């Protein structure tokens, strides 16, 4: 289907709405260099939990009970960014 598997770290900049997925994100509490940043999108969904323009540490959002972090990504706007290290 449409998730598509990204490769870790991760950017889009652009427009569009998109669906990806990984089971790549760190799970260690102790990381803080593994981040999820965006600006200017209308949406960042992971595995149903609002990340839109949030920083936010990999290790803060768990995975999906397949082990994967499933990414909605909206941007009507060119300056949209997403970054996933």
Same mark, same amino acid.
């Given at each position: 289907?449409?998730?598509?598997? =990204? $490769?870790?770290?991760?950017?889009?900049?652009?427009?569009g709405?998109?669906?990806?997925?990984?089971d790549?994100? !760190?799970?260690?509490?102790?990381?803080?260099?593994?981040?999820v940043? !965006?600006?200017?999108?209308?949406?960042?969904? =992971?595995?149903?939990?609002?990340?839109?323009?949030?920083?936010?540490?990999?290790?803060?959002i768990? $995975?999906?009970?397949?082990?994967?972090?499933? =990414?909605?990504?909206? !941007?009507?706007? !060119?300056?949209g960014?997403?970054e996933?290290?």
């Amino acid at each position: 289907g449409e998730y598509t598997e =990204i $490769a870790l770290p991760f950017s889009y900049d652009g427009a569009g709405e998109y669906y990806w997925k990984t089971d790549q994100f !760190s799970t260690d509490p102790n990381d803080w260099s593994r981040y999820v940043n !965006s600006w200017n999108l209308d949406l960042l969904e =992971i595995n149903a939990t609002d990340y839109t323009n949030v920083w936010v540490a990999q290790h803060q959002i768990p $995975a999906a009970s397949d082990g994967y972090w499933y =990414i909605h990504y909206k !941007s009507g706007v !060119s300056w949209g960014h997403v970054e996933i290290k």
